[PDB]
Amino acid sequence: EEKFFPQSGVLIFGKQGSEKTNVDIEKVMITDEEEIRTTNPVATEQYGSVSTNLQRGNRQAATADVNTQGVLPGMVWQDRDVYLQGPIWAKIPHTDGHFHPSP
């Protein structure tokens, strides 16, 4: 699925000589993430499917779809890549509640 990519999911880098607006795909270099398809799901894709209520001998068994999700124990992933044509490090917000402050 090279054609499709997250609308705002990844990064965009215009080749040398790009104006400020409405430039075309001809100029930028969109970041393909066909690499993490091992651990991390696809944002453009659904995530899972869960039970809707409680099937029974009279009422049919429902199966709800799950697009958005949260985190739970038993989950492992890998943050975004590097892209030297991009940022190198970031700044963590000095607050109290933070989690896996990976950029």
Ligand X SMILES: O=S(=O)(O)OC[C@H]1O[C@@](COS(=O)(=O)O)(O[C@H]2O[C@H](COS(=O)(=O)O)[C@@H](OS(=O)(=O)O)[C@H](OS(=O)(=O)O)[C@H]2OS(=O)(=O)O)[C@@H](OS(=O)(=O)O)[C@@H]1OS(=O)(=O)O
Residues of this chain that interact with ligand X (CB under 6 A) are: 53-54, 56, 59
Q: Shortest distance, CB of residue 59 to ligand X, whole angstroms?
A: 5
- Using a 10 angstrom Cβ sphere, with 0-12 exposed, 13-18 middle and 19 or more buried, the burial of residue 60 is exposed
Give the separation between CA 71 and CA 47, rounded to whole angstroms.
12
Note whether 97 binds its own copies by CB under 8 A. Answer: yes
Q: Identify what 59 binds: ligand X, its own copies, none; CB under 5 to 8 Å per kind.
A: ligand X
Q: Shortest distance, CB of residue 83 to its own copies, whole angstroms?
A: 10
Give the separation between CA 43 and CA 25, rounded to whole angstroms.
21
